[PDB]
């Protein structure tokens, strides 16, 4: 009962953590796409 | 109580899990950019 609601809140915090992890993975993919873009631009300039 | 005790552990570990997962994901993400740069360099 009460322990169920507490575990639900803890799982909500863990789900926020997992959503943050997924958003950070997407952001890392976008950042390394930008890194590939700047590397390609600098390599073309070189 | 059980409710008071149980919720604390997962909530506390959530931030550490998010930070570790973000760092790891960036770790293999930078690998793709480095590989593309290596192919361009070759």
């Amino acid at each position: 009962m009460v322990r169920f609601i507490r575990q639900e809140a803890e799982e909500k915090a863990n789900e926020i953590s997992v959503s943050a992890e997924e958003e950070f993975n997407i952001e890392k993919l976008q950042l390394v796409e930008a890194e590939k873009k700047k590397i390609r631009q600098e390599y073309e300039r070189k | 109580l059980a409710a008071e005790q149980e919720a604390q552990h997962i909530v506390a570990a959530a931030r550490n899990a998010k930070m570790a997962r973000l760092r790891q994901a960036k770790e293999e993400a930078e690998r793709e950019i480095a590989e593309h740069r290596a192919q361009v360099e070759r």
């Binding site: 009460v2 322990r3 639900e8 809140a9 803890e10 | 109580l1 059980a2 409710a3 008071e4």
Partner: peptide, 17 residues
């Protein structure tokens, strides 16, 4: 303060709170 122990027992029996 007197009923803290009884409240702890009741929370243990009945059961982010």
């Amino acid at each position: 303060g007197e009923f803290f122990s009884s409240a702890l027992t009741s929370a243990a029996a009945q059961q982010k709170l």
